[PDB]
Amino acid sequence: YGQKATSLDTLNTAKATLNNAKAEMDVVQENIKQAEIEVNTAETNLGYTKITS
Amino acid sequence: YGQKATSLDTLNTAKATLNNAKAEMDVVQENIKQAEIEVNTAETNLGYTKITS
């Protein structure tokens, strides 16, 4: 964009459509979490396999 | 173009394609001339209409 032309309208694509990419990846982190979590709790509702004394 | 975006590639259209308009009008001036000229000479080869004494 320092090369005079490349209209801001196509830099702005890149800016906001970088942050959207980045953030749409964060969402899939928090989802990775929630799935790891709810899976450990889904084996911790499987504590009950001897009913330990 | 002072309004940040409007890529130089579309300002340059306007610049050079102003000068081309302007200049393509000059050409038609010099043509207007050459036609006015060659028409007066085309009536001055019509001096010969009495062969004046």
Q: How far is A13 from chain B (nearest CA, A)?
A: 13
Chain A contact set for B6 (CB, 8 A): 7
Q: How far is A45 from chain B (nearest CA, A)?
A: 59
Quote the strand ranges of chain B, DSSP E. none
The nearest alpha carbon in chain A to B6 belongs to A7
Report resolution (Å) to 1 decimal.
3.5
Rounded to an integer, what distance in angstroms lies between the CA atom of residue B23 and that of residue B13? 15
Interface test with B, best of A1, A3, A4, A7 (most B CBs within 10 A): A7
> How many Cβ atoms from other residues are within 10 Å of residue A42's Cβ?
10
Amino acid identity at A50: K
Q: How far is A21 from chain B (nearest CA, A)?
A: 24
Does B3 contact chain A (CB < 8 Å)? no
Amino acid identity at B50: K
Distances (CA, A) of A5 to A15, B1, B12: 17, 10, 10
Measured distance between the N- and C-terminal CA atoms of chain B, rounded to whole angstroms: 71
Residues in chain A: 53
Alpha helices in chain A (DSSP H): 11-44
